């Protein structure tokens, strides 16, 4: 086992209805040589993250919502996405009044590749891999075009006025949403990204509805991830249906955060729930599978990788109330499939 003091609490890696990532670490595969992008709120300066992060980019076009004094820039630091007094609209709906900083991108990045076996904090699923933080979400979420520009650039796509990404990602984690079906432009950007050779892994969404009514799960060429509990059942918030392909642990997920309710104050660790936490389990397992395929000189297309991940899932706890794909992502079975 890795020596990280809080790894023992990360049931979602090793325990019942977890992803069996420990079995693959034991086999010697950790995501070595794989780049995963996290298209999210940005990144924290965090002792348990830094060593595994590569240069990213900040695609937030709104200077106000980015909280860093400018528009697009080369520092994807998460300044905090808190708001208060309906600063992001919606008055007088009490549900939209206020929120504390989520540190979402860092929590997600930690699930993929927290610095592991370093005697502090937590472990990550693909702790041999590296993450590129692609900041697209600020105070009031993100603009669609900022999200898809970032996604595309993260796979090695050229964006005008942005230096070319020197660390193209083979797995693109999008733990984000947006209401409604897939726009023609979004699909175009998604297809371009996939066809570069990158697997796009997305959170199914947290509105307890059919995923076909939300972006990006309504899009083609994305791997859509639902959220399960320690009980191996659907998390009550998880979007569902035919547009969900598989599931991963999505509640009581311990990862890297900051204690700050507004701006950053001190690096810490904390549990969260969301399909946003389930997606990085899948992205992490995808990186494990690529590292294994690399070891035998096997090329995997995103379609082939996606099929392995869906094909080899472990069983749900009996029966679900709504469809959540083929099963829970299983790193051990997935790697067994590629190594033959
Ligand atoms: Ca900026
Ligand atoms: Ca910035
Ligand atoms: Ca650690």
CATH code at position 3: 3.40.50.200
267: its two tokens: 């690096």
- Closest-approaching ligand to the CA atom of 42: 2
> Ligand 1 centre and the CA of 70: distance in Å?
4
User: Could you tell me the two tokens for 330?
Assistant: 């299983």
What does the alpha-carbon distance between residue 301 and residue 311 come to, in Å, rounded to a whole number? 15
Q: Which ligand sits closest to the CA of 41?
A: 2
Q: Has 281 been annotated as catalytic?
A: no
Distance (Å, whole) CA 134 – CA 73: 11
What are the tokens at 255? Answer: 């990862």
Which of the ligands is closest to the CA of residue 61? 1
In order of 148, 162, 233, 309, the CA distances from 188 in angstroms are: 10, 20, 34, 24
Any known ligand binding at 35? no
From CA 315, how far away is CA 232, in angstroms rounded? 8
Torsion-angle region of residue 54: left (phi > 0), alpha (psi -120 to 50) or beta? beta
Cα of 31 vs centre of ligand 3, distance in Å, is 16
Bond prior to 116 in cis (omega within 30° of 0): no
Tokens at 31, concatenated: 């995501």
Nearest to 112 by CA among 275, 277, 225: 277
For residues 155 and 20, give the distance between their C-alpha atoms in angstroms, rounded to a whole number.
27
What distance in Å separates the CA atoms of residue 79 and residue 72, rounded to the nearest whole number? 14
Q: State yes or no: 81 annotated in a binding site.
A: no
| Gap from CA of 318 to ligand 2 centroid (Å) | 46
Is 158 one of the annotated active-site residues of the chain? no
What separation in Å is there between the alpha carbon of 69 and the centre of ligand 2? 8
Quickly list H helices, 155-274.
184-195
Cα separation, 58 vs 40, in Å, equals 10
User: Nominal resolution in Å?
Assistant: 2.0
Residue 282 assigned as binding residue: no
- Centre of ligand 3 to C-alpha 146, Å, is 31
Select from 296, 272, 284, 297 the least CA-distant residue to 334.
284
Expressed in angstroms and rounded, the spacing between residue 66 Cα and the centre of ligand 1 is 5
Provide the residue range defining the domain that includes 84. 1-340
Which residues fall inside 5 Å of ion ligand 1, going by CB? 66, 68, 70, 73
Any binding-site annotation on 115?
Answer: yes
Active site residue 258: no
In our burial notation (b when 16+ CB lie closer than 10 A, e otherwise), range 31-46 reads bbebbbbbbbbbbbeb
β-partners of residue 173 are: 38, 201
Marked catalytic residue, from 154, 217, 224, 276: 276
If DSSP codes are grouped into helix, strand and coil, which group holds residue 225?
Answer: strand
Q: How many domains does the chain have?
A: 1
Query: What angle (nearest 5°) sits at the alpha carbon of residue 44, between those of residues 273 and 192?
Result: 75
Considering the candidates 37, 78, 81, 104, report the single residue annotated as catalytic.
104
110 with 124: CB under 8 angstroms?
yes
Cα 115 to ligand 3 centre (Å): 5
């Amino acid at each position: 086992a890795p020596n990280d003091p809080s790894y023992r609490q990360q049931w979602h890696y090793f325990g019942n209805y977890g992803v069996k990532a420990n079995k693959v670490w034991d086999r010697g595969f950790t995501g070595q040589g794989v780049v995963v992008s996290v298209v999210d709120t940005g990144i924290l300066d965090h002792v348990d993250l830094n060593g595994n992060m590569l240069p990213g980019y900040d695609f937030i076009s709104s200077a106000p919502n980015a909280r860093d004094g400018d528009q697009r820039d080369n520092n994807p630091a998460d300044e905090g996405d808190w708001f208060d007094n309906w600063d992001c609209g919606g008055y007088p709906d009490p549900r939209r009044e206020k929120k504390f900083s989520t540190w979402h991108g860092s929590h997600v990045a930690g699930t993929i590749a927290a610095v592991t076996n370093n005697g502090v904090g937590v472990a990550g699923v693909a702790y041999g891999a590296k993450v590129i933080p692609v900041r697209v979400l600020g105070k009031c979420g993100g603009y669609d075009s900022d999200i898809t520009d970032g996604m595309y650039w993260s796979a090695g796509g050229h964006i005008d006025g942005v230096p070319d990404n020197q660390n193209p990602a083979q797995v693109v984690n999008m733990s984000l949403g947006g209401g409604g079906g897939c726009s023609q432009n979004s699909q175009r950007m998604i297809d371009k990204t996939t066809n570069l050779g990158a697997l796009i892994v997305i959170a199914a969404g947290n509105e307890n509805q059919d995923a076909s009514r939300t972006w990006p799960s309504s899009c083609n060429n994305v791997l859509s991830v639902g959220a399960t509990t320690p009980k191996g059942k659907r998390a009550p918030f998880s979007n569902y249906g035919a547009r969900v392909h598989l599931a991963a642990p999505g509640t009581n997920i311990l990862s890297t955060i900051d204690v700050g309710q507004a701006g950053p104050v001190r690096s810490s660790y904390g549990m969260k729930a969301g399909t946003s936490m389930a997606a990085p389990h899948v992205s992490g397992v995808a990186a494990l599978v690529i590292s294994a395929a690399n070891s035998i000189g096997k090329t995997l297309t995103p379609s082939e990788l996606s099929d392995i991940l869906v094909r080899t899932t472990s069983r749900f706890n009996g029966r679900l109330d709504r469809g959540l794909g083929s099963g829970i992502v299983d790193a051990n079975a997935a790697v067994n499939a590629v190594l033959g």
